[PDB]
Amino acid sequence: LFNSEEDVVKMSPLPTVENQFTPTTAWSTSVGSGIGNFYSNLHPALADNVVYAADRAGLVKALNADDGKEIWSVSLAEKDGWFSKEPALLSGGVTVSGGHVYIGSEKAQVYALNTSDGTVAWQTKVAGEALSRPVVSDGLVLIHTSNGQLQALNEADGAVKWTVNLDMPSLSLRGESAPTTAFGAAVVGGDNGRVSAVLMEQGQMIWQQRISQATGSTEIDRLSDVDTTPVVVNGVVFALAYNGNLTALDLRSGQIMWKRELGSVNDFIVDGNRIYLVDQNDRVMALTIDGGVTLWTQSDLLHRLLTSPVLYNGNLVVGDSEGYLHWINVEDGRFVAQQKVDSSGFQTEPVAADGKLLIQAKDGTVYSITR
Amino acid sequence: CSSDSRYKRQVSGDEAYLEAAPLAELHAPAGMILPVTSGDYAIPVTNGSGAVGKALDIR
Amino acid sequence: EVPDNPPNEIYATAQQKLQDGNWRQAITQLEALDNRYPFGPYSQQVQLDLIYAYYKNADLPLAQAAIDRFIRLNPTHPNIDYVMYMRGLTNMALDDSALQGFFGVDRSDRDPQHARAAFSDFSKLVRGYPNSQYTTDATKRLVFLKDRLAKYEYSVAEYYTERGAWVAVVNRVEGMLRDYPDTQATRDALPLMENAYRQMQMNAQAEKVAKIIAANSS
Amino acid sequence: FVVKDIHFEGLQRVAVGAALLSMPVRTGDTVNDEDISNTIRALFATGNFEDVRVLRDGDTLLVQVKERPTIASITFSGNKSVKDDMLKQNLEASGVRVGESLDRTTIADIEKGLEDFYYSVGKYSASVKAVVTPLPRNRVDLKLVFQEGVSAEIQQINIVGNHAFTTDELISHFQLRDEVPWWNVVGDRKYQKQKLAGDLETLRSYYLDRGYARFNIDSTQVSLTPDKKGIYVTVNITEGDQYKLSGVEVSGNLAGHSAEIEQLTKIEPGELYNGTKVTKMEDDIKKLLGRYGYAYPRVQSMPEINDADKTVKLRVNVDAGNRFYVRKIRFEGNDTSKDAVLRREMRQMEGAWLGSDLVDQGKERLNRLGFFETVDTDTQRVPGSPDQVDVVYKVKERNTGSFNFGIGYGTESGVSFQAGVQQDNWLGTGYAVGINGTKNDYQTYAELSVTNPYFTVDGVSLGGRLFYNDFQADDADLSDYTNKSYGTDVTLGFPINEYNSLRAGLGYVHNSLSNMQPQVAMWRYLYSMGEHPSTSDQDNSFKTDDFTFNYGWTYNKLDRGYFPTDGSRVNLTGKVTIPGSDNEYYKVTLDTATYVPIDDDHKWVVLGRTRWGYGDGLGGKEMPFYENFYAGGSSTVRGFQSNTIGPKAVYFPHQASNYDPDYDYECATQDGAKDLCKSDDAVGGNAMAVASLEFITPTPFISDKYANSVRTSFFWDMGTVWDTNWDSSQYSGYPDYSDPSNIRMSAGIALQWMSPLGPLVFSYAQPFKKYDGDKAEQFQFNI
Amino acid sequence: ERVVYRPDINQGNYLTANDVSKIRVGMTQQQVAYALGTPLMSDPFGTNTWFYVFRQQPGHEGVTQQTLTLTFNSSGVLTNIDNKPAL
């Protein structure tokens, strides 16, 4: 009886299912358990048809495009953990800069694997698991970790450039604050309702702005935890704090041009003056950059755990954790193509790169998509 | 048999403190005197109005 | 109980069932009167009639909250003497309610927690209202109550004699001494301190008690 | 200009003057248009006025008021199994209730606190909706609507900084659970932040017993996963290295007991450090000095953790209290029971130094009381002197008196009844009374059982038991076994230890038999008596009067006398006849009752319940047939009817019972056949081995107001009563019961309900591998 | 009769052999009260005699007691240390 008393929240799965352009796959190959139904900051990389797919249990591959045959394949589940072949437990997403495949671990043992074979270019234990993808740029393996730390590591051996304290959430109030480089400033968001710029060159706070409060005494959403990844349009940061506060603001000082404290925002891109985002209700909206004014929107997808909104094959491709693909109109929110290529769900973002659209699904993992 | 109107009654009651207990005080020899009223057992023995017990009722 | 009615007719139905003896259903009025009209003029007297009805319907903690209410609701009132009396009168009835009295079984050896609390209220009556409508009544309680709490502590102090705890005999009956100057349980404890002295070889201290035995024989 | 009158319409439990004092301008005060507006928000500052319209007719005020007060009711519509009074505790916190005002602006704010109620549980998939429904004259019923989707549940733990111990083993070591498989079904695994914080200290002790004396936890961060479910937890610890207990340095006021302290510090220098073990040994000092009298020993240990050799040295700083703390003691919870009943139940004396264990000893006597609910106390040190402590034993008592189970036979067949009742120390006076008996038109029986258990200070247990069964087995008359059985049993209780206690007594039984059933085994006792009865016609009469010494001993280390959980109970009981008895025989008996807690939160306890007994004759006799062992029904095996475990005798072909009952009660008479017919009524053996295998289990569906009062236990109840000297020559075409493999097997569940008349134990139970001859009752009614 | 088994009886509020060496005749009550604290029995009506009386009974083996009463004067200065052993 006790199981039959709890209700659920309703969704809007798929009205106006259109396929007015046909959707298909570039290849569908499924490298398997990995990303999983388990919650994972890990996310693949795609470059030059060397399709860097991997598995959180340890198996790290590189695949070939158009077939998903493996260019190379290794594992990092070798002597890890307390019983020597534990799972690797990867936190940060797949980063490939040069001949190194950098992946952050939940062991906080970050890596670099030689992109020719998968052999370890370097590997280094860091402080705290990676809340972000290990942002490897300028030699710095810039990682915002779980302990509210900015760790830049060397991308040649793993020499930690600094471990600089950041926005510290009380618990692991989630949401990736990606350490991004903009105008020489290490620009990182925050799980405390703040965004910031730190020094890229040393880890010295350029500014940190109150983009106001997060979970704790004004509790914001824990079904929709805000992507605090900053997306700067060169002079104007367009970033969310951890209550869904999109903000136009200064990069050098953080001084606000306009903001959108409106509640938690799932996923987003700042596509010119057309900010395409996965809104609060798992729904699609187009905001502008002169204000966060709705240019157009779509509420056909409600409470469908969408992926990041990308523009591929001419239209707004948003996959979901229901395994469906949806080519939304780049104009007012209409399906252009719809493809349930997966049943396991897309937890990772559509890498609409290398001519393809790469996801790593949950257990139907590597499908790569075109139209 | 005896019950003829479905009573919830013919039960116990109280009388006891209307049979108030007389008390025999100190008669002890001098020098052998103890502060025997050190407890709170010393009331103003006052007989302001009203009956005693069940004769004393109100609305 | 009673819906949103004229407050007097709820009281009239209360004054019916108060005088019907139907405190089963008078409290059905008097609470429902105090449900929507506790600020009425007789609604303080409704609480006084609630204490009246709770007692006759044997609702002593509900009376006790209502008595404590009238401490707070009307700390200036003529019927606080009623409230002070009925608190101890509750604490009279709250302390012992067993049916063993027809079997002649003592309940003064039973726990006098509310009988000590009635010893507050009945004495706080004859202190705070030595003139009131219950002061002849409350004094009759305390005269009975003083030996009753003594026969409690007597039945305690009897046991150390039975235990042979002669150290615990004397200080208990010295406790009975300094508390109770006059009670017969202490007057029956008067030979016993002499005994424990002789069991503790305080015969010389006992023969001083034996003169007090001799002085307080009568 | 100046107010001449205030027209204040609308009050609702706010008095006129109570609002008028909140007003700034009153009955002759100068009034401007600011005094209009000042009066508006000041009457709004009452917190009880929905709308305030202060106007004035020229200069005399008029205030048009709308009223917030009494909330008429609050409906918690569809709340959940989560307690709505606790949701009303969120309401009681927010200044609003029945009889109180309600601003309609604070709806979502309390609803946020209603959600932060769930957010404190670990639920945020939840929506709360307070509907402010207006009721007469201003009033409001507050229907509250509750849409709680799911909560968050413990999913994964990530421990970083750990290097020596696997995380998943600690997940089992913590109460933070993350699986309920079908291949290993366990309890559930939901979230609470209180469970984490203690399980941090689980890990803290876990490293403390190792010797990780530079261990700490840095921080921890549980994932606020975007689902409102996913609990993944970064656990940031500083493991440190292993340190060794290598020196104890006790110091301070050792009170001349430092040698005894050194017995409490009998250690190995260089053993791996265990500060949890130190935590005991500091209290061992407090147990040492407590029973020495010092109830307040200031013990301050200090681990001088020497990291140069990776060791711990242990400073300890001791400061005892005073010896003669125990002045007197107090007892509470004898409002209907006797003070001397409570005063006898202790071992620390008033006016001594403290025996700290004697307090616990007497509290165990109150725990071994049985007619108690709680054994609590308050060791209040009466201040001013360090010699005055009053230990205020506030105890609580349970039920008293218990009536038996009766069934049928009344007002259809005359005035006939099965009776029995208890008094449970006769309302706690000191007189252990349970009195039964039954007058029927089949028999007549009475039984008094009275004991002053503490009749003298050495626990003299004033045992007197009298019996008179005018048992006739009334078909119509003395045709089928009358037996007027009567006599006494006077016993006394003897202390052997404070848990060991002896039993002894003498037994007088006088029986007056006539016209017994033609059972050869029944005659085989009479043949062992030397008497030669009719195997044929039931005519035999028998007058006996045995004089019999009784004895026994018990071991009572078992926690509660009404609802224990740990320990075991031994009860030796036996009887031997003396010269002068009409039969020379013996019979001994022994039963076991072990309380073994499966989990030491004591919701799961092994109840080992067995029965032993052997009795035979002395000088060519037998132990009598009524002393043969019976079971089934209730006694130790449920799933049967009573008297269904044991050997079974055979009627001999007889003709008349001195009256042939016409096709009733036929036992191979003329109306019956003329052959040896075996009756399947279990006539019992000389040996008894029957067991009850019971398992304490909690209930997750009952309020623990009285789920503590009930006792649910499963069983497979089984065993064998068998006669080691049963024959296979007289019982060749019948079962020989010298086999102990006469195994009657049953199984079921115990269903206790503690009524005000005590426990009402019920049992559905069925036999599966039962030995034959059993009368079975599936659902049974016991006490 | 003679029953060899009997649980023991004791009663404290006494003084040890160290305790009498702490004090002497001429000390006040208070000088004793810094050394010995308070008794659990003083005089009922008389002088300042501080009663520190041991009692112990094992059972069928006699009785053990040390009656040590400390008669201070009316001023509270000590006048008698009454050592009394068992009977």
Closest C-alpha among C109, E78, A276, A211 to residue D428: C109
Enter the tokens of residue D180: 């309920």
The domain segmentation of chain E, as residue ranges, is 9-84
Pick among C16, C48, C96, C178 to test the B interface (most B CBs inside 10 A): C178
**CB-based contacts of B15, cutoff 8 Å, min separation 6:** B53
Cβ–Cβ of E38/D326 closer than 8 Å?
A: no
> Is residue B29 less than 8 Å (CB to CB) from chain E?
no
The domain segmentation of chain D, as residue ranges, is 7-67, 71-150, 153-238, 244-319, 326-396
CATH number assigned to the domain covering D326-396 = 3.10.20.310
**Which residue among C95, C105, C158 sits closest to D335, beta carbon to beta carbon?**
C95
CATH number assigned to the domain covering D71-150 = 3.10.20.310
N-to-C CA span, chain D: 85
> Is residue E74 less than 8 Å (CB to CB) from chain B?
no
CA distance D710 to D720: 30
Helix C7-19 × helix C23-36 angle, to 10°: 160
Classify each residue of B1-18 as buried b or exposed e, where b means 16 or more C-beta atoms within 10 Å of its C-beta.
Answer: eeeeeeeeeeeeeeebbe
Pick among D119, D224, D229 to test the A interface (most A CBs inside 10 A): D224
Find chains touching chain D: ≥3 CB pairs under 8 Å: A, C, E
Q: Quick one: fold of D7-67?
A: Ubiquitin-like (UB roll) (3.10.20)
Find chains touching chain C: ≥3 CB pairs under 8 Å: B, D, E
> Is residue E46 less than 8 Å (CB to CB) from chain B?
yes
CB pairs under 8 A between C and D: 67
Q: Which CATH superfamily is domain D153-238 in?
A: membrane protein fhac (3.10.20.310)
> Is residue D386 less than 8 Å (CB to CB) from chain E?
yes
Q: Are D676 and D653 in contact (CB under 8 A)?
A: yes
Q: Are D400 and D423 in contact (CB under 8 A)?
A: yes
CA distance D264 to D288: 9
Enter the tokens of residue D224: 């606020």
The single residue listed with the structure tokens 């002593």 is C60
Contact residues on chain E for D458, CB-CB shorter than 8 A: 3, 6-7
**CB-based contacts of D499, cutoff 8 Å, min separation 6:** D555, D556, D557
The angle subtended at Cα D220 by Cα D215 and Cα D224, nearest 5°, is 165
Classify each residue of A182-192 as buried b or exposed e, where b means 16 or more C-beta atoms within 10 Å of its C-beta.
Answer: beebbbbbbbb
CA distance D107 to D74: 13
Contact residues on chain C for B19, CB-CB shorter than 8 A: 144
> Is residue A1 less than 8 Å (CB to CB) from chain D?
no
Closest C-alpha among C51, C194, C67, C45 to residue C120: C67
Enter the tokens of residue D100: 């109180």
Q: What is the DSSP letter of A302?
A: B
Q: How many helices (H) and strands (E) does chain A have?
A: 0, 32
* Chains B and A touch, contact meaning at least 3 pairs of CB atoms under 8 angstroms apart: no
Residue D237 distance to chain A (closest CA, Å) = 11
CA distance D472 to D493: 34
> Is residue A213 less than 8 Å (CB to CB) from chain D?
no
Q: If DSSP codes are grouped into helix, strand and coil, which group holds residue D736? A: coil
Instruction: List the beta bridge partners of residue A306.
Output: A320
Cβ–Cβ of A223/D222 closer than 8 Å?
A: no
Which spans in D419-542 are helix H?
424-428, 520-528
**CB-based contacts of A45, cutoff 8 Å, min separation 6:** A52, A93, A94, A95, A96, A101, A351
> Is residue C211 less than 8 Å (CB to CB) from chain B?
yes
Enter the tokens of residue C8: 């007097």
Q: Are C112 and C95 in contact (CB under 8 A)?
A: yes
Q: If DSSP codes are grouped into helix, strand and coil, which group holds residue D122? A: coil
Enter the tokens of residue A166: 């950041």
Contact residues on chain E for B31, CB-CB shorter than 8 A: 45-46
Pick among C159, C162, C174, C202 to test the E interface (most E CBs inside 10 A): C202
CA distance C95 to C91: 6
CA distance D108 to D85: 18
CA distance D65 to A367: 68
Specify the amino acid at residue B26: L
Residue B45 distance to chain E (closest CA, Å) = 27
* Chains E and C touch, contact meaning at least 3 pairs of CB atoms under 8 angstroms apart: yes
Question: Which residue of chain A is at minimal alpha-carbon distance from D219?
Answer: A147
Question: Which residue of chain D is at minimal alpha-carbon distance from A242?
Answer: D224
Q: What is the DSSP letter of D604?
A: E
CA distance D232 to D155: 6
Compute the radius of gyration of chain C from its Cα atoms: 23
**Resolution, angstroms, 1 dp:** 8.9
Specify the amino acid at residue A73: S
CA D747 distance to own-chain centroid: 23
Cβ–Cβ of C158/D340 closer than 8 Å?
A: yes
Pick the CATH number of D244-319 from 3.30.2180.10, 3.10.20.310, 3.40.630.30, 3.10.105.10: 3.10.20.310
Among left, alpha and beta (phi > 0; psi -120 to 50; other), residue D524 is alpha
Cβ–Cβ of E11/C167 closer than 8 Å?
A: yes
> Is residue E11 less than 8 Å (CB to CB) from chain D?
yes
Pick among E51, E70, E83 to test the C interface (most C CBs inside 10 A): E51
CA distance C79 to C64: 15
Instruction: List the beta bridge partners of residue E78.
Output: E72
Contact residues on chain A for D219, CB-CB shorter than 8 A: 147
The angle subtended at Cα C170 by Cα C168 and Cα C176, nearest 5°, is 105
Cβ–Cβ of C110/D352 closer than 8 Å?
A: no
Specify the amino acid at residue D569: R
Instruction: List the beta bridge partners of residue D766.
Output: D747
CB pairs under 8 A between A and D: 87
Helix C23-36 × helix C43-56 angle, to 10°: 150
Enter the tokens of residue D223: 């994932």
Cβ–Cβ of E12/D327 closer than 8 Å?
A: no
Helix C80-95 × helix C43-56 angle, to 10°: 20
Q: What is the DSSP letter of B28?
A: P
